[PDB]
From a paper:
In this paper, we present a strategy to fuse specific, high-affinity protein binders to obtain multivalent or multispecific scaffolds of predetermined geometry. DARPins are used as building blocks to confer the desired specificity to the construct.
Constructs off7_H09_3G124 (crystallized at pH 4.6) and off7_H12_3G124 (crystallized at pH 5.0) diffracted to 1.9 Å and 2.4 Å resolution, respectively. DARPin repeats carry a conserved TPLH motif in the first helix of the N-cap5, 23, and protonation of the histidine residues in this motif reduces stability and weakens the binding affinity of the DARPin moiety, leading to the loss of MBP and GFP from the ternary complex. Nonetheless, independent binding data at neutral pH strongly indicate that the conformation in solution must be closely similar to the design.
Residue numbers in the entry: 8 to 322
The structure:
């Protein structure tokens, strides 16, 4: 006998034709929701492609395999993303779909959403852990596919938004957001119009945890803003000694000059952070450095009455 096979075929065709009620009557009368045609296409594939959200939901509640792949390796999530069905994308992810499934060519759902500039879908995929730098067997990334189809400006908008959010998270000290943004593709070395990078902000506002994360992820420890200030300049001014150390342990230049000629020692002796001076001195800070006014860090320590600092600098 072959009643089960007969029901499966009728279900596939009812789904292929967008006959929601016919699909659900067949299901109610025993049709196998995990049936598949010659190409491995299942009913869930067809509902995800056609955008029939109600059918996607009931199929999943009836045990449809959310990650079923056809002969080319497409899952329902691949189709939902390629054909621009945001709600279905969200439902499949809620039901355990592999966000980073690969087809035979190695393309992920994020590849396909990026290709058409479906920004809302791109962002949900990244929120669920989509591999932002994934490459297919030919080395093409989601950004590459967007550019090839004239949608690069939409990917640049994504990156601009991630850049804004990373700077905000680094300035406000939100460790968890920083990590999730970096993993979603945020450029750790992005800078605003005045050359301030996330590391500048974290070091200035005293967010040690984020300084370590940014450096581990490749932030330039000696990046200079518009005024020539490195993160060590700002940390020395604000008085964050643990950050001063970390920056030095990661290769910060102790004698970096801003535009006025100030080294971190100029700024620390001025600010009155004695131990910072001692750490800088221990790390080879040049006590003889003169700024644009010909003044040394010793000259600045006097002008602030930090005789303890002006005494150790003498030694």
């Amino acid at each position: 006998h072959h009643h089960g096979s007969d029901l499966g075929k009728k279900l596939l065709e009812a789904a292929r034709a967008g006959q929601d009620d016919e699909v659900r009557i067949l299901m109610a009368n025993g049709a196998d929701v995990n049936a598949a045609d010659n190409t491995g296409t299942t009913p869930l594939h067809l509902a995800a492609y056609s955008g029939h959200l109600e059918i996607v939901e009931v199929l999943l509640k009836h045990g449809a395999d959310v990650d079923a792949s056809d002969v080319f390796g497409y899952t329902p999530l691949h189709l939902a993303a390629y054909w621009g069905h945001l709600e279905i994308v969200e439902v499949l992810l809620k039901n355990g779909a592999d966000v980073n499934a690969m087809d035979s060519d190695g393309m992920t759902p994020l590849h396909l959403a990026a290709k058409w500039g479906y920004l809302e879908i791109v962002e949900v995929l990244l929120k669920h852990g989509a591999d932002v730098s994934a490459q297919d067997k030919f080395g093409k990334t989601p950004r590459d596919l967007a550019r090839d189809n004239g949608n690069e400006w939409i990917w640049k908008l994504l990156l601009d938004a991630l850049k804004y959010l990373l700077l905000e998270a680094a300035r406000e000290g939100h460790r968890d957001r920083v990590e999730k943004l970096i993993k979603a593709g945020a450029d750790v070395n992005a800078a605003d119009d005045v050359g301030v990078t996330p590391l500048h902000l974290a070091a200035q506002r005293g967010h040690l945890e984020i300084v370590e994360v940014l450096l581990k992820c490749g932030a330039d420890v000696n990046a200079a803003d518009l005024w020539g200030q490195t993160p060590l300049h700002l940390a020395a001014t604000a008085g964050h000694l643990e950050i001063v150390e970390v920056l030095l342990k990661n290769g910060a230049d102790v004698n970096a000059r801003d535009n006025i000629g100030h080294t971190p020692l100029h700024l620390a002796a001025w600010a009155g952070h004695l131990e910072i001076v001692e750490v800088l001195l221990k790390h080879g800070a040049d006590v003889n450095a003169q700024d644009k006014f010909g003044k040394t860090p010793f000259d600045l320590a006097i002008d602030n009455g930090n005789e303890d600092i002006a005494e150790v600098l003498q030694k």
